[PDB]
Amino acid sequence: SGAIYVGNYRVVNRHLATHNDWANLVWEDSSRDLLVSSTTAQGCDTIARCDCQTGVYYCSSRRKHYPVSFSKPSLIFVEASEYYPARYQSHLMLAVGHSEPGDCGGILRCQHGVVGIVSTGGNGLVGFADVRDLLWLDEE
Ligand SMILES: C[C@@H](Cc1cocn1)NC(=O)c1nn(C)c2ccccc12
Ligand SMILES: [Zn+2]
């Protein structure tokens, strides 16, 4: 589990969105595994607007942050899970790192801010849904 709280937005994995998220929906995209809802309170996370391809992510199944090198956002074929059939996921970045299904929502960041959230994984890989192209997260 996990979310990004920037401005009056909450960014979560689409497959983990709650009824309150769907009832206060701003934007969703199944191909990216992302959903954004509106919030009453202002958040403290800042979105990275950069070209970093090294950063750190939070792994809840280890209670630890790990440094990683990650690929550029791409269209990758992801295997079936209980939330999606096997399909192409867009704007996905892969790294070598431990992960388990419940680690989705953990933040990947660099010195510039939040880069994305954990969305896929297995066998020593972890995949992150990028958010750096969603420029509208920075404005009302
Ligand atoms: C919950 C789904 C979401 C999903 C996105 O694309 C299709 N399904 N993801 C997973 O199944 C999953 N995510 N991580 C971090 C893993 C690590 C090890 C094994 C499985 C996973
Ligand atoms: Zn950066």
UniProtKB/Swiss-Prot annotation:
Zn(2+) 1 binds at residues 50, 52, 110, 112. The active site is at residues 15, 33, 104. It comes from the Viruses. It catalyses: Selective cleavage of Tyr-|-Gly bond in the picornavirus polyprotein. Homodimer. Cysteine protease that cleaves viral polyprotein and specific host proteins. It is responsible for the autocatalytic cleavage between the P1 and P2 regions, which is the first cleavage occurring in the polyprotein. Also cleaves the host translation initiation factor EIF4G1, in order to shut down the capped cellular mRNA translation. Inhibits the host nucleus-cytoplasm protein and RNA trafficking by cleaving host members of the nuclear pores. Counteracts stress granule formation probably by antagonizing its assembly or promoting its dissassembly. This is Protease 2A. It comes from Coxsackievirus A16 (strain G-10). The chain holds residues 869 to 1008 of 2193 of the full protein.
